[PDB]
């Protein structure tokens, strides 16, 4: 029994988020493997095999059966500190756990800063196009 904010640190919570995940028995990227690797399932109508690292917030889609979630995570987000954690959840100390949650909080904020940047640039493109068109 942990608060909602912290559940994603629990493997079994992460596994539970996989609802209608297509890759099951026989595949390398099963819910169990995705979850061990830190991923949560975050599907859209648009992008339905979308998954996200709960810790560094990197999102990945286009999953294929033979994809090893751990190697995919290393490839696309080499610096994610969850990948460094070798001890089991319950073997962590509260100090270690609190250190991790702080790094996660920083990761969230960095990601939101990076999204707001991308949104601002997209709006700036449209504005630029609109002005060019009215100049022409």
């Amino acid at each position: 029994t942990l608060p909602p904010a912290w559940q994603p640190f629990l493997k079994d919570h992460r596994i539970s988020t996989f609802k209608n995940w297509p890759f099951l028995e026989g595949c390398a990227c099963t819910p169990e493997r995705m979850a061990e690797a830190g991923f949560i399932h975050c599907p859209t109508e648009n992008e339905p095999d979308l998954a996200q690292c709960f810790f560094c917030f990197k999102e990945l889609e286009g999953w294929e059966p033979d994809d090893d979630p751990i190697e995919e995570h290393k490839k696309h987000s080499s610096g994610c500190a969850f990948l460094s954690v070798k001890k089991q959840f319950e073997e962590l100390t509260l100090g270690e756990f609190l250190k991790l949650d702080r790094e996660r909080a920083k990761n969230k904020i960095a990601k939101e800063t990076n999204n707001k940047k991308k949104e601002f640039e997209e709006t700036a493109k449209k504005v630029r196009r609109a002005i060019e068109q009215l100049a022409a």
Binding site: C29, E47, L50, E59, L60, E61, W63, E64, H76
Partner: peptide, 5 residues
């Protein structure tokens, strides 16, 4: 897998 579109 690959990054988001």
């Amino acid at each position: 897998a690959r990054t988001k579109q």
